[PDB]
């Protein structure tokens, strides 16, 4: 006569949360965007189809110079590519071959990665002794790693498959703070443009707005209906759109605190795996499992464009920090550049 | 622009060094047969003749990966194992209803849309424990069609083993075979075995050789 009391009280809490979400929801975005003009048929073709990988590319992150890009494979390679002259800059052989994430630092001096080895390995690129080598390894998780991101040159934030995100300091080498509260595998992170608070999409059909300062789940978004695979904050920081296995994208916002937009057609039946925005925030790029990448209008929910291309599914997508290119990394061992 | 061209030439030299290193890694990758082990440890007699295991049989190098240090929501890391060659699915065949959930995990591995090209080596340990389990009277409480599943005509049992033991043994073998034939186009085949101690890696090597040969015959459209 104790446990049921607070869980029906939690049900009542969820009831007034839903009442507060409904009462502040006078007009959806899709009915007040009909006054603005669509962006028409957007053609983008392959500028450089960079070919270096022996196996499927599972992750990718552009550099803040919008020139270099890390690509990690289940080959066991992490090869750092120069996107203009379509050639290699580094090739790091990893410790465990199954890696699922990679992150090029905003300074450029480090590259983190991690996979089923439960360890975030941070490689240095600016060693005075020449060759690249593992500057730090981070081992405090009990599940795998799905997405790691650099807040700055000094501290990483990791998403794991044991319901935890984590802020790690690299110099100390242990978890500065944890982030618990999910119930499923936490599949993707997204840092805000001011890097004070990150959004985490997981396998409980929810996305939690955390914050790295004091370390708590300040917001929680339950609008999806399947496992959320990828997430990316809107370029201002007030919204984020995220995609899940139910073959849709959903745009949420961090202040109105509900779902704003749903992106799904009748041909869209494959659960998606990557989202990103343009620099303006108008094009929600989303890479899927029907081997294509839809280019959604992030304000009017139309298929503005369709990236054709890859022979197997995509698994990572990244837009440059000046908005110049859309790199899609896939399972046919290539990653192509779109523009 | 002189130092531009010299920097581009140095970058192209780095490109050629990395490209020849990656073709050497292609020649060591495309001949490395790797296999997922996903059964309740026990591989200590498979390695000796924490996650991975690089061993070798007859100039063919295998890369076993054990997944004991993950959670049991398997639906997100098991999608990493696409280019893997075989899945050693180990069934502790007697001890609850472990067998039906093992069948459900095998059905889920079988019908997953990113694992519908790779094949499952199927080991079944504890067959002596299943022998004293069928001689005690408990699979008949779990499986009703076992009451009328007659012993097959293509049986290759142990000479001297009790007929109820081989009855339950080939019953659950054909139940895994019913799952692995009820949904498939011939892209991948379950390879059942029964063990436990002996050279299990000989069965692993023969079955992975059969997987590679059937894949090469499917891509010539001979099979």
């Amino acid at each position, epitope marked *: 006569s104790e446990l049921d009391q607070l869980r029906q009280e939690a049900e009542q809490l969820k009831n007034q949360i839903r009442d507060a979400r409904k009462a502040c929801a006078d007009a959806t975005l899709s009915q007040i965007t009909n006054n603005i003009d669509p962006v028409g048929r957007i053609q983008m073709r392959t500028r450089r189809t960079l070919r270096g990988h022996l196996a499927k590319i599972y992750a990718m992150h552009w550099g803040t110079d919008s020139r270099l890009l890390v690509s990690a494979s289940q080959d066991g390679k992490l090869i750092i590519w120069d996107s203009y002259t379509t050639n290699k800059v580094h090739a790091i052989p990893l410790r465990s071959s199954w890696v699922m994430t990679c992150a090029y630092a905003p300074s450029g001096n480090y590259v983190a990665c991690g996979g089923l080895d439960n360890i975030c390995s941070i490689y240095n690129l600016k060693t005075r002794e020449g060759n690249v080598r593992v500057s730090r390894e981070l081992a405090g998780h009990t599940g795998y790693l799905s997405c790691c991101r650099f807040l700055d040159d000094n501290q990483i934030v990791t998403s794991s498959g044991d319901t935890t995100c984590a802020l790690w300091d690299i110099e100390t080498g242990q978890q500065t703070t944890t982030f618990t509260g999910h*119930t499923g595998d936490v599949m993707s992170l997204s840092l805000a443009p001011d890097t004070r608070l990150f959004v985490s999409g997981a396998c409980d059909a929810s996305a939690k707005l955390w914050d790295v300062r004091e370390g708590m789940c300040r917001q929680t978004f339950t609008g999806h*209906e399947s496992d959320i695979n990828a997430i990316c904050f809107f370029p201002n920081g007030n919204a984020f759109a995220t995609g899940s296995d*139910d073959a849709t994208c959903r745009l949420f916002d961090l202040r109105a605190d509900q779902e704003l937009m749903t992106y799904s057609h009748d041909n869209i039946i494959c659960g998606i795996t990557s989202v990103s925005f343009s620099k303006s925030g108008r094009l929600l790029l989303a890479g899927y499992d029907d081997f294509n990448c839809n280019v959604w209008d992030a304000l009017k929910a139309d298929r503005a464009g369709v990236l054709a291309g890859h022979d197997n599914r995509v698994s990572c997508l990244g837009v440059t920090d000046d908005g110049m290119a859309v790199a899609t990394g896939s399972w046919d061992s290539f990653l192509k550049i779109w523009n | 622009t002189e130092d531009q061209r010299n920097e581009e030439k140095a970058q192209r030299e780095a490109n050629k060094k990395i490209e020849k290193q990656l073709q050497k890694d292609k020649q060591v990758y495309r001949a490395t047969h790797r296999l997922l082990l996903l059964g309740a440890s026990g591989k200590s007699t498979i390695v000796k003749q924490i996650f991975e295991t690089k061993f070798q049989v007859d100039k063919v190098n295998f890369h076993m990966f054990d997944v004991g240090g993950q959670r049991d*929501e398997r639906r997100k890391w098991i999608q990493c194992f696409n280019d893997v060659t075989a899945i050693i699915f180990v069934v502790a065949s007697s001890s609850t209803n472990r067998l*039906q959930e093992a069948l459900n995990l095998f*059905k889920s591995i079988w*019908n997953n849309r990113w694992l519908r090209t790779i094949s499952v080596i199927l080991f079944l340990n504890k067959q002596d424990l299943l022998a004293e389990k069928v001689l005690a009277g408990k699979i008949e*409480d779990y499986f009703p069609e076992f009451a009328r599943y007659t012993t097959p005509e293509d049986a290759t049992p142990e000479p001297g083993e009790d007929p109820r033991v081989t009855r339950a043994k080939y019953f659950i073998r054909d139940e895994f075979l019913r799952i692995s034939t009820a949904s498939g186009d011939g892209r991948h085949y379950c390879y059942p075995h029964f063990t436990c101690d002996t050279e299990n890696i000989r069965r692993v090597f023969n079955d992975c050789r059969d997987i590679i040969q059937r894949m090469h015959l499917r891509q010539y459209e001979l099979l």
Partner: nanobody
Amino acid sequence: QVQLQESGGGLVQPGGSLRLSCAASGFTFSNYKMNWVRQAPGKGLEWVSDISQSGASISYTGSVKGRFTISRDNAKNTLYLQMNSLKPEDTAVYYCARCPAPFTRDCFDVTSTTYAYRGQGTQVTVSS
């Protein structure tokens, strides 16, 4: 929000009949194959039944073959499980876990009590 409210069950003499149901709201019910899982006291979660997206391809666990029957209605967004000829082995906490993807034929929801898309649970105790 994916929520799964189940109702039914209680104290029934073994040999009678019983009925569980669960309403499923938060998604398109017409696209997920559905399951029924149970937790026996002193054991883990064990699978009982599956049904496909439409309702044709049904499957049961071996211990309930002929005894139990599940049936889904997307027009009501709910699922019913009829327990005919109840047994003393059926004293368990009952769960209607769904499967996490549209238009698929695989499920990974017999976990060690950590799954998000699963109901709260109905205790069905079988005594004298």
